[PDB]
């Protein structure tokens, strides 16, 4: 009976669920009282127009799904007005409210780990047995709003153990217990501003750790819906032409 509305876009949501909201590193997104000069031409703080409810195309969870990931702000880089701002500006800075939700029956089964890993650098295979440094294409490093599927979830496609992914801001989605997860991410960089199209501040991982299951006859694919809203987005730069 609860409908959360923010903007032009409205979303129906159950919250807050099993473990409350995870505020990443115990720190809410904030504006920039501090950096840079500060100059008169500096930040442009839009609201709430740009900072709205964006809902990506739903992903279909399968028995054999290895997992997905998204890169920020690359996901919204071509999506609506945020995409417009990120492209035709020079400097960028923002926080994010990330919301991941499943629709499943009480006869479905499985567990997703939803996590946020700052500076998520991808590593691909150098040959199954061998040493060839090939570096991932744009389709893999910056997979856009459609996201990308993990090839080797165990090492997070970066030689790094998923068993320890919970050191990052995370929330479990256990179909038995909860169907949704919310993670709040502040801007995290070694600089106050950076390039929106050239640097991905963090990645969003959604990996099944306990495989989806069901008796035959039940819906064989479970939808994973992702709604994300920038929170204290800040665009310096000025004018640009694609």
């Amino acid at each position: 009976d609860r409908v959360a509305q923010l903007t032009i876009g409205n979303s129906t949501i159950t919250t807050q669920e099993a473990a409350n909201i995870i505020v990443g590193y115990g720190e809410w997104p904030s504006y920039c009282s501090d950096s840079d000069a500060t100059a008169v031409d500096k930040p442009t703080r839009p609201d709430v127009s740009v900072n709205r409810f964006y809902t990506l195309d739903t992903k279909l969870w399968e028995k054999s799904s290895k997992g997905w990931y998204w890169k920020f702000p690359d996901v919204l880089t071509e999506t609506g007005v945020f995409g417009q701002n990120a492209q035709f500006h020079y400097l960028y800075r923002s926080g994010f409210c990330i919301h991941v939700q499943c629709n499943a029956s009480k006869f479905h089964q499985g567990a997703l780990l939803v996590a946020v890993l700052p500076e998520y650098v991808i590593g691909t295979v150098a040959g199954g047995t061998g040493t060839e440094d090939s570096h991932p294409p744009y389709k893999q490093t910056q997979p856009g709003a459609d996201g990308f599927e993990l090839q080797h979830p165990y090492v997070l496609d970066a030689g790094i153990p998923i068993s320890q992914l919970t050191v990052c801001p995370h929330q479990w989605i256990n179909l038995r217990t909860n169907n949704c997860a919310t993670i709040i991410v502040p801007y995290i960089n070694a600089l106050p501003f950076d390039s929106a199209l050239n640097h991905c501040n963090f990645g969003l991982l959604v990996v099944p750790i306990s495989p989806l299951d069901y008796d035959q006859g039940a819906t064989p694919v479970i939808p994973i819906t992702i709604t994300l809203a920038p929170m204290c987005s800040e665009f310096a730069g000025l004018r640009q032409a694609v």
């Binding site: 890993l117 650098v121 295979v125 150098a126 047995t129 440094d133 570096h135």
Partner: peptide
């Protein structure tokens, strides 16, 4: 920002690449 500890052998100095094994 803490992150998982390297799980696989290193291949190159400049990137986290790993082998298919």
């Amino acid at each position: 920002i803490p992150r998982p500890m390297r799980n696989q052998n290193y291949l190159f100095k400049a990137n986290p690449n790993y082998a298919g094994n």
